[PDB]
Amino acid sequence: IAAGTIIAGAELTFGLLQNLLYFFANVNRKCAVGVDNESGFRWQEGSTYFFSGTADENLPYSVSDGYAVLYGPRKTNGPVATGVVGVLAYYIPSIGKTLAVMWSVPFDYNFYQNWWNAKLYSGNQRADYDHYVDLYYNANPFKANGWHERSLGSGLKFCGSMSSSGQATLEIHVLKESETCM
Amino acid sequence: IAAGTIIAGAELTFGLLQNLLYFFANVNRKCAVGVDNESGFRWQEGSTYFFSGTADENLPYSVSDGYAVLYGPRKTNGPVATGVVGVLAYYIPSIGKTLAVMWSVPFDYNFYQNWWNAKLYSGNQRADYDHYVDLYYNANPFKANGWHERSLGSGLKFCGSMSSSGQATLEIHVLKESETCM
Amino acid sequence: IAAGTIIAGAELTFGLLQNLLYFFANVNRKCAVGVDNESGFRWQEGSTYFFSGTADENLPYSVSDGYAVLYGPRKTNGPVATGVVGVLAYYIPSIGKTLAVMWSVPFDYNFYQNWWNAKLYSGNQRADYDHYVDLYYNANPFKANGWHERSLGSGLKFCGSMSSSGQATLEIHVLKESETCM
Amino acid sequence: IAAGTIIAGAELTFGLLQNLLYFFANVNRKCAVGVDNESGFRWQEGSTYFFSGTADENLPYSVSDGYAVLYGPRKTNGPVATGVVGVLAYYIPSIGKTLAVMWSVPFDYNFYQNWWNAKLYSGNQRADYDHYVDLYYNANPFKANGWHERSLGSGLKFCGSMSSSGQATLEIHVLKESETCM
Amino acid sequence: IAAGTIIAGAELTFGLLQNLLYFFANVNRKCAVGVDNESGFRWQEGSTYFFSGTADENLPYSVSDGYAVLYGPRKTNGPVATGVVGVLAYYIPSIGKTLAVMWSVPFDYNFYQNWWNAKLYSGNQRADYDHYVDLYYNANPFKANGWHERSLGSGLKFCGSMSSSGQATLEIHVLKESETCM
Amino acid sequence: IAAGTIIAGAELTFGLLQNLLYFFANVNRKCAVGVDNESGFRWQEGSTYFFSGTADENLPYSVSDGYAVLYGPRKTNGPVATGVVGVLAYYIPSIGKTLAVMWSVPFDYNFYQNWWNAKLYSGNQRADYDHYVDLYYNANPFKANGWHERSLGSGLKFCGSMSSSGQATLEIHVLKESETCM
Amino acid sequence: IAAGTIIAGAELTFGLLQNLLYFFANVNRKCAVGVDNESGFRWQEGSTYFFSGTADENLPYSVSDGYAVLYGPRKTNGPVATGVVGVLAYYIPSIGKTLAVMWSVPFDYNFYQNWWNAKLYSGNQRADYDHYVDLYYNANPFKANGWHERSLGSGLKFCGSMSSSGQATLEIHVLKESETCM
Amino acid sequence: IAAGTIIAGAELTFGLLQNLLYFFANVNRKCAVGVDNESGFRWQEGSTYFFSGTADENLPYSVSDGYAVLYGPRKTNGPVATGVVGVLAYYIPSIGKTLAVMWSVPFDYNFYQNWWNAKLYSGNQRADYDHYVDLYYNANPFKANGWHERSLGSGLKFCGSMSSSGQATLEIHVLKESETCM
């Protein structure tokens, strides 16, 4: 009989749902990824993988001694409950290895936190899910609590830090083992 | 009897539909297509095909050694569920062949992803659906996961990459076989 | 009896109609018409015809060797379902002929597409409906799919292209038969 | 009995009427009138008449060889269905005649179109309704379809054009009979 | 009984009245009054009268050979149906007379039009209602239809014009009888 | 019984009252008070009184030959029906007297108008209500109708004027008796 | 029974209360406190107390001969009925005393007014409630009515003034007894 | 029966709750932390801990004699009732100790106030909850009431101050024991 009650229930439902989708569309995640080639070797064949999120730009094809990658990963547009998570990688012909760098800026800080890592892999490889799993679970990732340092092997080491924010910054310097960081 | 219930159902219907059409009108797709003539040959007769989308500008008629195409493909205006997908092509008189470059930035990332390709075709040809089908299905397109390289034949090769975003960037360098990319 | 139902039907009707007229008022059509006098002859008596649309400016009275027309045709203001369609023309005293250039940027891309053309006509003539019909139906117009070239006769040729967008650009170079375009 | 139906009919009526008056207040008409004194004689006693519309500025009192009038006629403010229509005039002591220039930018392009004219009148006269009627009905006005030229007599001629838009531009050059226009 | 009908009649009444007062508050009248002392005599004791309207600034105390008054009369703020109407005056010690300048920019162009005047009065006098009545009714005011000229006596003359707009401009040059205006 | 009629009467009452308080909060009064020390004596101990209104700034402590006070009195914030009315004063040690300057910019121009005055008082005194009453009622204030001049005594005179607007300007020059104003 | 009357009473209540809290959040109080060290002694250990309000900045640690404190006290954010009231203090090692400066910009000008003071206290002390009570009640504070001057003792004096506005300015110069203020 | 009362109770509930969450999302807390290395020793391995809040940036890896940390802690985004509270730390190789600096800008000033501290700890340590507890409860923190100074030991001391605002500033200078602060 009282069909106006069903119309009012629809107006309440879409009036809630349009604002709920507008919330998930407006919560934002970023990672300003800076990686600095202090290494004395040329990096090439710039490769990426995204477990979540995207970027609007390319990596440099190559990086050379004293220059840096700057890259801007972000969350996918629209009402998605996913952060920005991924790998970037470069081949290093002068040592026969691939440098891979991982970051993980989640959506829910109830369950997760900002993590990052870097490693050298044998031969020419490009960033994929097996690099994400190995950099996130098998290796020890670093968390967003200031500056950390580790040997890469093959005469290199990395020094780096990440913000605890969801609009994060990541900075890494890939030095020779002889050098003092920053 | 209660005609106000039909008026309230119409207000609910158009109140939903005006916002649904406003959604499809505001989700946007782009491809910033850069193609760089490192080739040592003049390109001419700049031609295009669009399977979906448009651009507000012309290609250069010609490109010459060390200059680049910059072109801005985009989605068609209004409430359409179509991305930007197309071909650009140039004749190369010095080798008797047509360079064609393809990109595909879809609407639904549920079903599709960003793809691109480039190839040399025999004689003077202009971009059309047969170049789109051959660059997308018969040849192997490259996906949006960093830098890729392939020989074109006739002394040329291409090196290029594409963003995974729907507001994409595409960059290609069309080098001689003797050269090192970027 | 229930006169409030007629008032609510009027509020629904004008609430729809004010938004429908606002839609047709906001969908826009343009043609940025550039025509370049590479011809070695002075053009004069700049004339126009509009089958649909207008412009807020005059043509140059005359154009001379190495200068260009730039002209901005547009859709008529308000809730009209018409594009921008027209002819511009110039007399060329040094050959005894009229150059006429046509463009057609439609409203409905369901039924129509962007077309353009150029031709030389005998004697001093000014742009009118007979030039529109002859440039659109009797001659072969060119479509918005990259660069096209044709001989005009009397020692001239044209080279030109048009955008597939509804906010189009048109570019034409009117060269001598001896020259290489752009 | 049901007085709320009369209140709802009043809210509908003023809700329509406030938007109808806002429409007529926002449709705009202009004429950017440029008149260029290439004549070799000083013009003085700058006079105006408006059949419809106004301007917020004065004419120059005088114009001299190689300078120009620039004048900005416009529609009267508020919800009026009238365009901008008028005459400007100057006395020319060196020939004993008055130059008068007319323009007519209508409201309804359903019934009317953009017209303009210019003429020389005997003795010192100022712009009035008899100049409007003689320039619009008795003389042949020119329409908004590109550049037109006519002899004034007394060793002068005019060359000029007008836009077909309702936010029009009018340009006139008042040359000696010896000269080539623009 | 049905007191909600009286509340709805009040909401309709104040909903109309707030918009009616907002209309009368937003219709604006101005006069940009420029008066230029080409006279060879110093003007002093700058005086004003307003029959309607105000200004936010002072006159210069004095004006001297080759300088000008610029003054910005305007309508009184808020929902008043009155224009800007007034007199400015200066004493001229070198001839023993007061220059007075009048303007009248009305509210209703249904009943009134833009008028202005200027005159010399005997001795040191300051602008008041008797100067307004004598400049508007007893003397012949000039209307807003281009440039007008008259002798003041005492070796002076004025040349001037006014806009027909309600946001008017008034320009007057107060020359010696020997000179040619502007 | 029908308690919704009392709620609707409250919504009408606060819907009116919030707009009435917003009106009294937005009608504004100012006085840009400029006072110029052409006097050849130093002024010091800058003092103020406000009968209505305030300022956000201090007076200069002192003023010296050829410098000026600039001061910006204004209406008190919020829904108050009061203008800006007050006194500023300075001691002049070189003559043993206090200069006091008064202004009165009212709220209701139905009952009041812009008045101002200046006077010299014996000894070191600071601005207070007895200076306001003596400058406004016992002395002859000047009204907002152009430039006025009066002797102060002790070898000084003042020359000054005030705007008739509620956002007024006041300008005063405090000269020696030997000098000609502005 | 009629539960919609309780919902309408809640909508009226929160519709009033959200606007009442927005009023108390938007009425603002400030004191731009400038204190100028004309004293010939270094000030150090810059200390503060707030009876009401806060600032977003630090005092200078120290001030030295010819430099000034500039400090911006303000009201606490949100719907609080409290002004800005406080003390700033500095130790002066060269005389063995603490300079303390007090200001009081209230919320309710119905009950209170702008007051300020300054004094020298024995030994190294920091601003607290006992300095506020002694500067406000036991000593004679100065009110916002122009420039005031007093001896501090120990060879110093202060000269200063405060605005009567709630967005106040306070200026104080701390001179030697030999000097003439500003 | 009357289901519209439940819909109206839902509209009231979400209409309140959307504004309550918007309040907690818009109340903001910051700490602009400046720490100045006047110490004559290099600081390195910049480390952080957050008990509440985040930052969008990294610390410098290292700081050296005469340079400063500038760091911008802030509240976590969205409707959370938590301030910004944390520790930053650096290792100092030249003395074998870790400098740690703490700040605490709360949400509820009903229960808490702005506190800060600094201390030297033995060996290379990184900021964590045990440094927060020791700097906040076991050591004596300083409150937001002007400049404070303390010996660190190992030849160093700190001098610093903090704002009482919730958008706070913190400034610390880490001097040698020989020096005079700021």
PDB file of N, CA, C and O in Angstrom, chain C residues 3-4 7 10-11 14 18 42 45-48 50 53-62 74 77 126-127, chain D residues 5 8-9 12 15-16 19 144-149 159 161-165 167-171 181-182:
ATOM      1  N   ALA C   3      -5.161  19.018  -6.716  1.00  0.00           N
ATOM      2  CA  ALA C   3      -4.397  19.958  -7.547  1.00  0.00           C
ATOM      3  C   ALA C   3      -2.887  19.979  -7.250  1.00  0.00           C
ATOM      4  O   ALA C   3      -2.088  20.230  -8.151  1.00  0.00           O
ATOM      5  N   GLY C   4      -2.461  19.635  -6.027  1.00  0.00           N
ATOM      6  CA  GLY C   4      -1.043  19.493  -5.672  1.00  0.00           C
ATOM      7  C   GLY C   4      -0.291  18.462  -6.525  1.00  0.00           C
ATOM      8  O   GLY C   4       0.897  18.633  -6.785  1.00  0.00           O
ATOM      9  N   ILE C   7       0.719  20.479  -9.636  1.00  0.00           N
ATOM     10  CA  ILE C   7       1.865  21.317  -9.246  1.00  0.00           C
ATOM     11  C   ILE C   7       3.156  20.486  -9.145  1.00  0.00           C
ATOM     12  O   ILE C   7       4.185  20.884  -9.684  1.00  0.00           O
ATOM     13  N   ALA C  10       4.264  19.678 -12.645  1.00  0.00           N
ATOM     14  CA  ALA C  10       4.911  20.865 -13.201  1.00  0.00           C
ATOM     15  C   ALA C  10       6.340  21.047 -12.657  1.00  0.00           C
ATOM     16  O   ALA C  10       7.265  21.238 -13.440  1.00  0.00           O
ATOM     17  N   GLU C  11       6.558  20.918 -11.348  1.00  0.00           N
ATOM     18  CA  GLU C  11       7.904  20.993 -10.757  1.00  0.00           C
ATOM     19  C   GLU C  11       8.850  19.921 -11.318  1.00  0.00           C
ATOM     20  O   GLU C  11       9.992  20.233 -11.655  1.00  0.00           O
ATOM     21  N   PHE C  14       9.489  21.105 -15.281  1.00  0.00           N
ATOM     22  CA  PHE C  14      10.447  22.204 -15.403  1.00  0.00           C
ATOM     23  C   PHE C  14      11.797  21.861 -14.766  1.00  0.00           C
ATOM     24  O   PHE C  14      12.828  22.250 -15.305  1.00  0.00           O
ATOM     25  N   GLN C  18      14.722  22.429 -17.506  1.00  0.00           N
ATOM     26  CA  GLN C  18      15.822  23.361 -17.226  1.00  0.00           C
ATOM     27  C   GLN C  18      17.195  22.677 -17.304  1.00  0.00           C
ATOM     28  O   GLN C  18      18.155  23.286 -17.770  1.00  0.00           O
ATOM     29  N   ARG C  42      49.037  37.228 -53.522  1.00  0.00           N
ATOM     30  CA  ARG C  42      48.189  37.883 -52.513  1.00  0.00           C
ATOM     31  C   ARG C  42      46.732  37.430 -52.614  1.00  0.00           C
ATOM     32  O   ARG C  42      46.147  37.454 -53.693  1.00  0.00           O
ATOM     33  N   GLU C  45      39.762  40.205 -50.252  1.00  0.00           N
ATOM     34  CA  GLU C  45      38.294  40.193 -50.192  1.00  0.00           C
ATOM     35  C   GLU C  45      37.759  39.009 -49.378  1.00  0.00           C
ATOM     36  O   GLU C  45      36.825  38.317 -49.779  1.00  0.00           O
ATOM     37  N   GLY C  46      38.369  38.771 -48.218  1.00  0.00           N
ATOM     38  CA  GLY C  46      38.022  37.676 -47.320  1.00  0.00           C
ATOM     39  C   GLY C  46      36.527  37.584 -47.041  1.00  0.00           C
ATOM     40  O   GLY C  46      35.930  38.490 -46.470  1.00  0.00           O
ATOM     41  N   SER C  47      35.918  36.479 -47.440  1.00  0.00           N
ATOM     42  CA  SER C  47      34.478  36.241 -47.459  1.00  0.00           C
ATOM     43  C   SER C  47      34.127  34.999 -46.654  1.00  0.00           C
ATOM     44  O   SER C  47      34.922  34.070 -46.615  1.00  0.00           O
ATOM     45  N   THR C  48      32.941  34.922 -46.054  1.00  0.00           N
ATOM     46  CA  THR C  48      32.502  33.732 -45.306  1.00  0.00           C
ATOM     47  C   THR C  48      31.051  33.369 -45.578  1.00  0.00           C
ATOM     48  O   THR C  48      30.230  34.209 -45.935  1.00  0.00           O
ATOM     49  N   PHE C  50      28.207  30.602 -43.385  1.00  0.00           N
ATOM     50  CA  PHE C  50      27.931  29.630 -42.336  1.00  0.00           C
ATOM     51  C   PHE C  50      26.619  28.916 -42.605  1.00  0.00           C
ATOM     52  O   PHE C  50      25.552  29.527 -42.586  1.00  0.00           O
ATOM     53  N   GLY C  53      26.525  27.571 -37.010  1.00  0.00           N
ATOM     54  CA  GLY C  53      27.543  28.254 -36.215  1.00  0.00           C
ATOM     55  C   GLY C  53      27.850  29.674 -36.686  1.00  0.00           C
ATOM     56  O   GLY C  53      27.197  30.208 -37.579  1.00  0.00           O
ATOM     57  N   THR C  54      28.823  30.300 -36.034  1.00  0.00           N
ATOM     58  CA  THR C  54      29.213  31.714 -36.156  1.00  0.00           C
ATOM     59  C   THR C  54      30.692  31.880 -35.790  1.00  0.00           C
ATOM     60  O   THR C  54      31.363  30.909 -35.448  1.00  0.00           O
ATOM     61  N   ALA C  55      31.224  33.100 -35.842  1.00  0.00           N
ATOM     62  CA  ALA C  55      32.477  33.473 -35.195  1.00  0.00           C
ATOM     63  C   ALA C  55      32.374  34.898 -34.630  1.00  0.00           C
ATOM     64  O   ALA C  55      31.590  35.703 -35.126  1.00  0.00           O
ATOM     65  N   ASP C  56      33.149  35.237 -33.600  1.00  0.00           N
ATOM     66  CA  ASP C  56      33.114  36.550 -32.920  1.00  0.00           C
ATOM     67  C   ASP C  56      34.067  37.598 -33.524  1.00  0.00           C
ATOM     68  O   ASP C  56      34.264  38.678 -32.969  1.00  0.00           O
ATOM     69  N   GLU C  57      34.687  37.273 -34.655  1.00  0.00           N
ATOM     70  CA  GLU C  57      35.798  38.001 -35.266  1.00  0.00           C
ATOM     71  C   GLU C  57      35.667  38.064 -36.793  1.00  0.00           C
ATOM     72  O   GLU C  57      34.894  37.322 -37.399  1.00  0.00           O
ATOM     73  N   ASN C  58      36.423  38.954 -37.423  1.00  0.00           N
ATOM     74  CA  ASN C  58      36.535  39.037 -38.873  1.00  0.00           C
ATOM     75  C   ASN C  58      37.693  38.175 -39.391  1.00  0.00           C
ATOM     76  O   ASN C  58      38.710  37.999 -38.720  1.00  0.00           O
ATOM     77  N   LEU C  59      37.591  37.711 -40.633  1.00  0.00           N
ATOM     78  CA  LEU C  59      38.776  37.321 -41.389  1.00  0.00           C
ATOM     79  C   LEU C  59      39.689  38.535 -41.615  1.00  0.00           C
ATOM     80  O   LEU C  59      39.182  39.653 -41.724  1.00  0.00           O
ATOM     81  N   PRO C  60      41.006  38.360 -41.795  1.00  0.00           N
ATOM     82  CA  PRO C  60      41.825  39.363 -42.462  1.00  0.00           C
ATOM     83  C   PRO C  60      41.219  39.760 -43.818  1.00  0.00           C
ATOM     84  O   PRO C  60      40.775  38.878 -44.554  1.00  0.00           O
ATOM     85  N   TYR C  61      41.243  41.039 -44.209  1.00  0.00           N
ATOM     86  CA  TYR C  61      40.826  41.431 -45.565  1.00  0.00           C
ATOM     87  C   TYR C  61      41.659  40.728 -46.631  1.00  0.00           C
ATOM     88  O   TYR C  61      41.131  40.271 -47.643  1.00  0.00           O
ATOM     89  N   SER C  62      42.962  40.625 -46.378  1.00  0.00           N
ATOM     90  CA  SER C  62      43.964  40.083 -47.283  1.00  0.00           C
ATOM     91  C   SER C  62      45.006  39.258 -46.541  1.00  0.00           C
ATOM     92  O   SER C  62      45.245  39.451 -45.352  1.00  0.00           O
ATOM     93  N   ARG C  74      32.607  28.602 -34.392  1.00  0.00           N
ATOM     94  CA  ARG C  74      32.004  27.949 -33.224  1.00  0.00           C
ATOM     95  C   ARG C  74      30.503  27.705 -33.377  1.00  0.00           C
ATOM     96  O   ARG C  74      29.858  28.311 -34.222  1.00  0.00           O
ATOM     97  N   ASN C  77      25.214  29.951 -29.645  1.00  0.00           N
ATOM     98  CA  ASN C  77      24.896  29.823 -28.216  1.00  0.00           C
ATOM     99  C   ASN C  77      23.461  29.340 -27.953  1.00  0.00           C
ATOM    100  O   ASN C  77      22.545  29.590 -28.736  1.00  0.00           O
ATOM    101  N   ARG C 126      32.215  35.076 -53.920  1.00  0.00           N
ATOM    102  CA  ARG C 126      32.214  35.064 -52.453  1.00  0.00           C
ATOM    103  C   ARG C 126      31.466  33.862 -51.908  1.00  0.00           C
ATOM    104  O   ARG C 126      30.509  33.401 -52.520  1.00  0.00           O
ATOM    105  N   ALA C 127      31.939  33.353 -50.773  1.00  0.00           N
ATOM    106  CA  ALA C 127      31.434  32.147 -50.142  1.00  0.00           C
ATOM    107  C   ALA C 127      29.910  32.199 -49.971  1.00  0.00           C
ATOM    108  O   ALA C 127      29.362  33.183 -49.478  1.00  0.00           O
TER     109      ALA C 127
ATOM    110  N   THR D   5      -2.537  24.823  -1.720  1.00  0.00           N
ATOM    111  CA  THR D   5      -2.451  24.667  -3.185  1.00  0.00           C
ATOM    112  C   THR D   5      -2.198  26.001  -3.897  1.00  0.00           C
ATOM    113  O   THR D   5      -1.444  26.043  -4.866  1.00  0.00           O
ATOM    114  N   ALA D   8       1.532  26.808  -3.086  1.00  0.00           N
ATOM    115  CA  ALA D   8       2.360  25.979  -3.958  1.00  0.00           C
ATOM    116  C   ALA D   8       2.341  26.462  -5.424  1.00  0.00           C
ATOM    117  O   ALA D   8       3.383  26.498  -6.079  1.00  0.00           O
ATOM    118  N   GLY D   9       1.187  26.908  -5.935  1.00  0.00           N
ATOM    119  CA  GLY D   9       1.087  27.563  -7.244  1.00  0.00           C
ATOM    120  C   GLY D   9       1.868  28.882  -7.319  1.00  0.00           C
ATOM    121  O   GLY D   9       2.511  29.155  -8.335  1.00  0.00           O
ATOM    122  N   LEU D  12       5.693  27.791  -7.396  1.00  0.00           N
ATOM    123  CA  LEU D  12       5.958  27.359  -8.771  1.00  0.00           C
ATOM    124  C   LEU D  12       6.059  28.563  -9.725  1.00  0.00           C
ATOM    125  O   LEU D  12       6.967  28.623 -10.549  1.00  0.00           O
ATOM    126  N   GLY D  15       9.168  30.705  -8.765  1.00  0.00           N
ATOM    127  CA  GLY D  15      10.299  29.826  -9.073  1.00  0.00           C
ATOM    128  C   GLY D  15      10.589  29.719 -10.573  1.00  0.00           C
ATOM    129  O   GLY D  15      11.751  29.685 -10.972  1.00  0.00           O
ATOM    130  N   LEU D  16       9.562  29.740 -11.429  1.00  0.00           N
ATOM    131  CA  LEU D  16       9.721  29.857 -12.880  1.00  0.00           C
ATOM    132  C   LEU D  16      10.142  31.278 -13.279  1.00  0.00           C
ATOM    133  O   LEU D  16      11.149  31.455 -13.962  1.00  0.00           O
ATOM    134  N   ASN D  19      13.745  32.555 -12.751  1.00  0.00           N
ATOM    135  CA  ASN D  19      14.655  31.919 -13.704  1.00  0.00           C
ATOM    136  C   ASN D  19      14.459  32.434 -15.139  1.00  0.00           C
ATOM    137  O   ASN D  19      15.432  32.574 -15.874  1.00  0.00           O
ATOM    138  N   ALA D 144      26.491  40.589 -42.376  1.00  0.00           N
ATOM    139  CA  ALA D 144      27.647  39.938 -41.768  1.00  0.00           C
ATOM    140  C   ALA D 144      28.145  38.693 -42.530  1.00  0.00           C
ATOM    141  O   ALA D 144      27.989  37.566 -42.068  1.00  0.00           O
ATOM    142  N   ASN D 145      28.736  38.877 -43.712  1.00  0.00           N
ATOM    143  CA  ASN D 145      29.273  37.806 -44.563  1.00  0.00           C
ATOM    144  C   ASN D 145      30.629  38.163 -45.206  1.00  0.00           C
ATOM    145  O   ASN D 145      30.861  37.938 -46.392  1.00  0.00           O
ATOM    146  N   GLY D 146      31.548  38.721 -44.420  1.00  0.00           N
ATOM    147  CA  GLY D 146      32.895  39.091 -44.856  1.00  0.00           C
ATOM    148  C   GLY D 146      33.043  40.531 -45.340  1.00  0.00           C
ATOM    149  O   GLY D 146      32.215  41.385 -45.039  1.00  0.00           O
ATOM    150  N   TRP D 147      34.146  40.828 -46.025  1.00  0.00           N
ATOM    151  CA  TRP D 147      34.544  42.189 -46.402  1.00  0.00           C
ATOM    152  C   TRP D 147      33.788  42.742 -47.605  1.00  0.00           C
ATOM    153  O   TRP D 147      33.650  42.063 -48.621  1.00  0.00           O
ATOM    154  N   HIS D 148      33.341  43.994 -47.486  1.00  0.00           N
ATOM    155  CA  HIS D 148      32.598  44.782 -48.472  1.00  0.00           C
ATOM    156  C   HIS D 148      33.259  46.144 -48.667  1.00  0.00           C
ATOM    157  O   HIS D 148      33.878  46.664 -47.748  1.00  0.00           O
ATOM    158  N   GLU D 149      33.111  46.752 -49.838  1.00  0.00           N
ATOM    159  CA  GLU D 149      33.715  48.046 -50.173  1.00  0.00           C
ATOM    160  C   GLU D 149      32.741  48.919 -50.974  1.00  0.00           C
ATOM    161  O   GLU D 149      32.031  48.410 -51.842  1.00  0.00           O
ATOM    162  N   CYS D 159      35.849  50.488 -46.685  1.00  0.00           N
ATOM    163  CA  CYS D 159      36.073  49.058 -46.774  1.00  0.00           C
ATOM    164  C   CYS D 159      35.811  48.481 -45.384  1.00  0.00           C
ATOM    165  O   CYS D 159      36.326  49.024 -44.417  1.00  0.00           O
ATOM    166  N   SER D 161      33.942  45.012 -42.637  1.00  0.00           N
ATOM    167  CA  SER D 161      33.292  43.726 -42.388  1.00  0.00           C
ATOM    168  C   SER D 161      32.723  43.631 -40.980  1.00  0.00           C
ATOM    169  O   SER D 161      33.126  44.379 -40.092  1.00  0.00           O
ATOM    170  N   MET D 162      31.789  42.699 -40.773  1.00  0.00           N
ATOM    171  CA  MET D 162      31.135  42.461 -39.492  1.00  0.00           C
ATOM    172  C   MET D 162      30.980  40.963 -39.195  1.00  0.00           C
ATOM    173  O   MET D 162      30.690  40.186 -40.103  1.00  0.00           O
ATOM    174  N   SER D 163      31.127  40.553 -37.934  1.00  0.00           N
ATOM    175  CA  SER D 163      30.848  39.194 -37.453  1.00  0.00           C
ATOM    176  C   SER D 163      29.362  38.836 -37.515  1.00  0.00           C
ATOM    177  O   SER D 163      28.519  39.688 -37.268  1.00  0.00           O
ATOM    178  N   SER D 164      29.019  37.568 -37.748  1.00  0.00           N
ATOM    179  CA  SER D 164      27.634  37.065 -37.689  1.00  0.00           C
ATOM    180  C   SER D 164      27.145  36.732 -36.269  1.00  0.00           C
ATOM    181  O   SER D 164      25.953  36.523 -36.065  1.00  0.00           O
ATOM    182  N   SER D 165      28.045  36.682 -35.287  1.00  0.00           N
ATOM    183  CA  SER D 165      27.756  36.480 -33.865  1.00  0.00           C
ATOM    184  C   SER D 165      26.909  37.600 -33.250  1.00  0.00           C
ATOM    185  O   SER D 165      26.916  38.721 -33.741  1.00  0.00           O
ATOM    186  N   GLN D 167      27.700  38.666 -30.147  1.00  0.00           N
ATOM    187  CA  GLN D 167      28.775  39.414 -29.504  1.00  0.00           C
ATOM    188  C   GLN D 167      29.742  39.932 -30.584  1.00  0.00           C
ATOM    189  O   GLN D 167      30.915  39.572 -30.615  1.00  0.00           O
ATOM    190  N   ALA D 168      29.214  40.704 -31.535  1.00  0.00           N
ATOM    191  CA  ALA D 168      29.847  41.019 -32.809  1.00  0.00           C
ATOM    192  C   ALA D 168      31.106  41.893 -32.711  1.00  0.00           C
ATOM    193  O   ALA D 168      31.312  42.639 -31.754  1.00  0.00           O
ATOM    194  N   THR D 169      31.899  41.882 -33.785  1.00  0.00           N
ATOM    195  CA  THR D 169      32.936  42.871 -34.102  1.00  0.00           C
ATOM    196  C   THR D 169      32.586  43.547 -35.429  1.00  0.00           C
ATOM    197  O   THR D 169      32.161  42.862 -36.351  1.00  0.00           O
ATOM    198  N   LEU D 170      32.745  44.865 -35.550  1.00  0.00           N
ATOM    199  CA  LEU D 170      32.610  45.627 -36.796  1.00  0.00           C
ATOM    200  C   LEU D 170      33.921  46.361 -37.056  1.00  0.00           C
ATOM    201  O   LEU D 170      34.394  47.074 -36.182  1.00  0.00           O
ATOM    202  N   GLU D 171      34.510  46.215 -38.240  1.00  0.00           N
ATOM    203  CA  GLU D 171      35.715  46.949 -38.631  1.00  0.00           C
ATOM    204  C   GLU D 171      35.510  47.653 -39.963  1.00  0.00           C
ATOM    205  O   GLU D 171      35.108  47.018 -40.930  1.00  0.00           O
ATOM    206  N   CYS D 181      42.748  48.760 -49.878  1.00  0.00           N
ATOM    207  CA  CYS D 181      42.346  48.466 -48.500  1.00  0.00           C
ATOM    208  C   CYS D 181      43.280  47.461 -47.800  1.00  0.00           C
ATOM    209  O   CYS D 181      43.736  46.496 -48.418  1.00  0.00           O
ATOM    210  N   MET D 182      43.548  47.681 -46.505  1.00  0.00           N
ATOM    211  CA  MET D 182      44.173  46.745 -45.556  1.00  0.00           C
ATOM    212  C   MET D 182      45.218  45.807 -46.179  1.00  0.00           C
ATOM    213  O   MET D 182      46.281  45.585 -45.603  1.00  0.00           O
TER     214      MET D 182
END
